[PDB]
Curated annotation (Swiss-Prot):
Keywords assigned: Oxidoreductase
Family: Belongs to the MsrB Met sulfoxide reductase family.
Pfam families: SelR (PF01641)
Top-level class of the enzyme under EC nomenclature: oxidoreductase
Protein source organism: Bacillus subtilis (strain 168)
A GO-annotated cellular component: cytoplasm
Biological classification of the source: Bacteria, Bacillati, Bacillota, Bacilli, Bacillales
One function term, GO molecular function aspect: peptide-methionine (R)-S-oxide reductase activity
The keyword Flavoprotein belongs to this UniProt entry's keyword annotation: no
Catalysed conversion reaction: L-methionyl-[protein] + [thioredoxin]-disulfide + H2O = L-methionyl-(R)-S-oxide-[protein] + [thioredoxin]-dithiol
Domain MsrB: 5-126
UniProt cross-references to PANTHER family, sorted A to Z: METHIONINE SULFOXIDE REDUCTASE, PEPTIDE METHIONINE SULFOXIDE REDUCTASE MSRA_MSRB
Protein known as: Peptide methionine sulfoxide reductase MsrB
Enzyme nomenclature, EC number: 1.8.4.12
Amino acid sequence: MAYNKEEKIKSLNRMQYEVTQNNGTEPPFQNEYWDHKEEGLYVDIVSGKPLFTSKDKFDSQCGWPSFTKPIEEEVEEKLDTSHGMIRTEVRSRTADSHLGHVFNDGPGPNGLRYCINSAALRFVPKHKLKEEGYESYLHLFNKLEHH
């Protein structure tokens, strides 16, 4: 039995779906291997799209990594109501809906609490980003606009 990056994402997206659908938590795995604190990004594995930086990462101390800073490019903040209370979730339309949930109780630029699940995440070091397209990744990890 072979195993390619296609079959990687296919088997993966079952578990990513388990999180999106039921708010399902990954089992005890999310440690120094999966979310390694070396400089880079934390991306939704389904697409490899930048959600938040390792430069400004918060660790899974509150169960899931919850920082004040999203990446405005591929992250959509989207209001909902389950039962009498409103909530906001960060969720794309097509595929990236696995990101996480954000709350107006957390202080931020807009005043949202950027809380992403570790199951949907892979650490991608600045070294590995250079292999995968640094001009897309490192631009969001580190930029400057000299006027």
